[PDB]
Amino acid sequence: TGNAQKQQDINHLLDKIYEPTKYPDLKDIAENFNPLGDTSIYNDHGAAVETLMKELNDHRLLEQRHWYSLFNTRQRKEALMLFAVLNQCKEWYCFRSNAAYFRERMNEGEFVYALYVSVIHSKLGDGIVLPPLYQITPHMFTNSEVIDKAYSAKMTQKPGTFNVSFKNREQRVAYFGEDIGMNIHHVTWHMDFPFWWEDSYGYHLDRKGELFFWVHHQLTARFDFERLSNWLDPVDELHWDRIIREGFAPLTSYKYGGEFPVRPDNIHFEDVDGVAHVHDLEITESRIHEAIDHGYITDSDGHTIDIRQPKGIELLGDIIESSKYSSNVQYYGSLHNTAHVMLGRQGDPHGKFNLPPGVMEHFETATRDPSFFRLHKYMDNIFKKHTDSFPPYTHDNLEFSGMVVNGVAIDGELITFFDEFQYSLINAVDSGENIEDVEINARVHRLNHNEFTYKITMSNNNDGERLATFRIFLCPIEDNNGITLTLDEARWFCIELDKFFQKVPSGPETIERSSKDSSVTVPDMPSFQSLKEQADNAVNGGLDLSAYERSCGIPDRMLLPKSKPEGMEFNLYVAVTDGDKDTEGHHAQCGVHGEAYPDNRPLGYPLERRIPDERVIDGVSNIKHVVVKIVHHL
Amino acid sequence: TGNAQKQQDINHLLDKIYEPTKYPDLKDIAENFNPLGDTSIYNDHGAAVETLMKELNDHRLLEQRHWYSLFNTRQRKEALMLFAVLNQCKEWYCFRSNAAYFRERMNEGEFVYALYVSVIHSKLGDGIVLPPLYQITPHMFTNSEVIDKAYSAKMTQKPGTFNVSFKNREQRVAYFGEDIGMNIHHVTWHMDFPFWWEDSYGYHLDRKGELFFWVHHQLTARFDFERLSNWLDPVDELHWDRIIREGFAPLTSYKYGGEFPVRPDNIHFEDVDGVAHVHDLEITESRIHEAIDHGYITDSDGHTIDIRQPKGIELLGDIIESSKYSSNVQYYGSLHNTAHVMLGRQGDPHGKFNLPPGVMEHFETATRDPSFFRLHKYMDNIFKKHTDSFPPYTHDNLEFSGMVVNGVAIDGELITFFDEFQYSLINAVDSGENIEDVEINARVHRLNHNEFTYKITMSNNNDGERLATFRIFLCPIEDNNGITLTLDEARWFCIELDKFFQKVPSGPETIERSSKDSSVTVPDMPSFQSLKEQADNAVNGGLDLSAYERSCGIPDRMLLPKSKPEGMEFNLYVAVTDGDKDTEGHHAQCGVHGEAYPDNRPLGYPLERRIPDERVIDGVSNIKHVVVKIVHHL
Ligand SMILES: [Cu+2]
Ligand SMILES: [Cu+2]
Ligand SMILES: [Cu+2]
Ligand SMILES: [Cu+2]
């Protein structure tokens, strides 16, 4: 073991992935190993192994140097079998071996996918930090131009970094969707808590349901915000009976595959052969919308499982996205997933052209296409229908008697601008042998803000020390019409900025906290070379980069919304609930390994419920709202 | 001079076009020359030169390593200025110089275009054979896959040759449209007789009008035939008020530019910003259709120019395509051309995506897209409306008293199969310096037939030697329903197979002629390396290369249609008209330089007119029809 070992191995595995490995060890392994000759390394007595082999043998596994979408029911199954081996290894000797043996005869997508999920969930992958997808397989995160510029570099053996690109559209709020950080998170989030997880794999992802509800509600919110800042209007909800108003051209290309199919604007949704009928959604949507409206979800037996309770919204998220936690998957089908594949072939439904899958039929690339947000607004208000059926909250309800926020102040400035980043285009260009490596780079333009700190002034009238949950939302104020909405109109529009638990003493305290300590944030990740340089140094000298092991969050750069240059006033919500009942039972942020989500309040507390008369939020001591102002430096 | 010189120079000029020249001579020229210091080499006292310079100087000329469509009113103008210099050179010292000087600071497309047109039309380019576009700029004629396979070859410096590709469509009659020979011809035909020719350039292309009418009538016919052979039905005529039923994905890529924009099926024609309104066509079409119907074309003054005469159909072709021979271009606009650009941006009319031009906005690539033939059927029956207004032909009309065809026979076997061809992908991949040349090749699958000869047996009942025009059409018989049409239904459907003038001696003769001597055919062209090798062998060893210096025709391989394996019976038409009245006045096939078309009969004689009662064709001695049969070897 070690890690600067485990780590090393990983880096080697995912190095120049589109070509047989150049690391000699990996290849004699790749050749001499037999996953079937010491059914003991395996905790299954190698049933997993024996099942991959069988396929690899009848050679009925997807070919190498071919595309792969995680939405392809077979490609998925294959990818997921590698997971299942790697997964029941007792120690490194068995992982390295397989993710070498297979690495060399299994397709790259299945492989990249398999290795990551495996590293993330398997018992055996603690020490490791995974290189950033963007540099491992750059075709999924880089433009088509820069890609070709990189192939030229290589043809000519002349190095250097190319500048990527992005007045005519709404490819004005593009900086958001096309960011390599969001794209990362978006994929990671669904790697952390995959739709395909069976608790057989080892543990149970806790509230994947609410997690699902919430994560998208926030992309959806975060997204709505940016369009605000751009004189753009909140996003249309997608309907199956209407036209797809805003279509786009991605100008993105597959490594092996071709160029992502484009969609024209004002198109009519076609029945796509092999996935499902347009109507098939319409009905699914109905079945869903009836559970919500009845009060119950009905399983396979005709057993009504009640959802007019706290477990409610997850049971709902199980049927909506359609993970395996689904009660009656034969009835409620899979709205979300199908909706993906469904929106993707819109470029070729009967498939007369044999265009590859589309931007939306992939996690590291969906945020790309505009209907992405159109499709999640729709999912969003499916949930809202349920979320909203609860009776508003009472006074006695929000009140954390004693504790009272006196004041809230921002110790700094809220200022956002446009930084510049560089990732490397090397895994993208093929370098054969005895021809050498030319360093080609890609330079992108991403958003950023300035660290700032919070000065939360507040008195614990209670006799002594109480644990407290510091909940901070950033809601909007006006309409982009100039209509000041109402913490009903705006409660749902708010994006979570931070959530943390601090013990409060008996008396006037002044709790301070930084842009940096935010719980919904993750720093940009270490470069690959960086992770190489570092793996290698430990192994030859004698790696606690327990910075980057889990990381569920969004990019720190994305914390605050972009804003206007003129500036705008947002409304800052500081709600301080009672820590002892919250954490009334138990990372725990990235419960990647079965780790029980620590907060018990539902998600978005306490703005997740109808707020009919603001009269109320306003009279609980432990809730306080102060207006902030964000400015954008050009 | 020489030619094995002129030639050499050319080959050098058009080598690895996408990069500054490696031929030292070309560069000191490229540097030291000044197109403005001996205004004497120029027959204009260099007004041309002084106009390019002015642009090159204010640097308002299109950039290098960028795309270019010949449909772009500016790109065209720029391209066409180079033509105008190269054009008024007195000798080689001035051409070489310029097409060196410019070659290095003008864009490649303008440049390639400029050089060819210039070589083709300028007084000074007799000896020369131009390399095949397909190998000069392979991106416009080669797939998107093979192209990438070639970039890989190059990256790794491992040579190869790749096999190109083409059950779900009508990309079953694809072999026709995607052939590198047709594509060549199509562009050449439009280089030979350009729409932009002003007679200031030096001479007058004779019947560009009828030429235009006809050339497209035959692609259109030839095309209809192939679809026959494929259980496919004759092509729909395109309308501006209907859906674009049948769209395609070209899977083709620009060198500098991106991937050609694709079109979804069942699309509605959008008003495309910058080119023209959909309605703008509709009216044009009307104005056109009213000339035809009135009997006259009305010019700018309100002068009615009659067209119910022989000059008729060309005057019509001048206004329809809209060349500069147009009588009232401000009124009849440019249906054909505009229709090209109009159909191309259908992927991006308001241009929100900034997709490059499309397959149809280029001559070496339009035959690609299915609406290509849909758009020419439409143009086709615009002409037919006029062509058909003439009173049928009388008996006394077709009769070449004396001369009488006794019999007609094919002396071979009519057999068409699928050969294999290889062109080179080198100008496509960038090779910088001190990095050496790897030979990469592309292998295509093209149609072919077997030389066969005609055995035309016929007696001269007259008293002593009459000249004769041997006109041979290949008409269809059955419907693809199995209905069997009527040399009215089928007269227009016939493709020209040969046309030649032979002296018929008095009495029983038996003229024989070959597949090879056909007048509507051209052999595949010499390779580039071949043309290099041969150019090069004749500097050093003190070049005829005469077979390919103009070349209007279609590929010999395309002579006969594809057919069925079962075989089908076509109807062979041998009509022998009177040579002395035909050539009653004067290459002359490729009148590229002002050379008066030799035949005087209108075009398609004598099948261009309504044939109401076959009763007639049937009773002129000098017309004879015999059924042939074509078989396809799988
Ligand atoms: Cu997602
Ligand atoms: Cu989603
Ligand atoms: Cu044409
Ligand atoms: Cu045309």
Side-chain angles (χ1 to χ4, degrees), chain A residues 578-613:
Chain A
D578 176 330
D580 281 24
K581 195 183 298 66
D582 283 21
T583 55
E584 183 181 71
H586 20 56
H587 249 52
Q589 313 318 133
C590 221
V592 165
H593 308 206
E595 321 160 295
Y597 193 62
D599 177 357
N600 281 297
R601 264 25 281 133
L603 275 77
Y605 189 99
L607 303 201
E608 90 279 5
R609 206 167 293 210
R610 292 204 310 299
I611 295 185
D613 85 9

Side-chain angles (χ1 to χ4, degrees), chain A residues 37-57:
Chain A
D38 178 6
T39 292
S40 167
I41 42 185
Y42 301 123
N43 282 270
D44 51 345
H45 297 120
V49 201
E50 273 179 62
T51 305
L52 184 29
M53 297 305 299
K54 199 189 176 185
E55 299 297 313
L56 177 65
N57 282 287

Side-chain angles (χ1 to χ4, degrees), chain B residues 5 44 52 82 177 206 249 278 299 355 478 488 521 536 558 604:
Chain B
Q5 289 273 60
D44 51 345
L52 183 29
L82 209 179
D206 213 21
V278 184
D299 65 34
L355 231 59
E478 313 219 333
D488 203 38
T521 283
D536 274 329
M558 318 286 268

Side-chain angles (χ1 to χ4, degrees), chain A residues 151-152 154-157 168-169 246-249 251 259 262 264-266 351-353 355 430-432 435, chain B residues 151-152 155-157 168-169 246-249 251 259 262 264-266 270 350-353 355 429-430 432 435:
Chain A
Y151 295 162
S152 270
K154 198 35 161 292
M155 318 199 206
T156 68
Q157 302 248 261
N168 250 146
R169 315 193 56 192
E246 205 63 48
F248 94 158
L251 267 32
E259 270 222 329
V262 33
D265 37 273
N266 303 301
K352 310 179 189 181
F353 308 132
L355 231 59
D430 21 75
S431 185
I435 180 65
Chain B
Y151 295 162
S152 268
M155 317 198 205
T156 69
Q157 302 244 265
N168 250 147
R169 315 192 57 192
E246 203 67 42
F248 94 158
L251 267 32
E259 275 220 325
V262 36
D265 37 269
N266 302 299
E270 274 224 62
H350 331 310
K352 307 179 183 175
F353 309 131
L355 231 59
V429 309
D430 21 75
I435 184 61

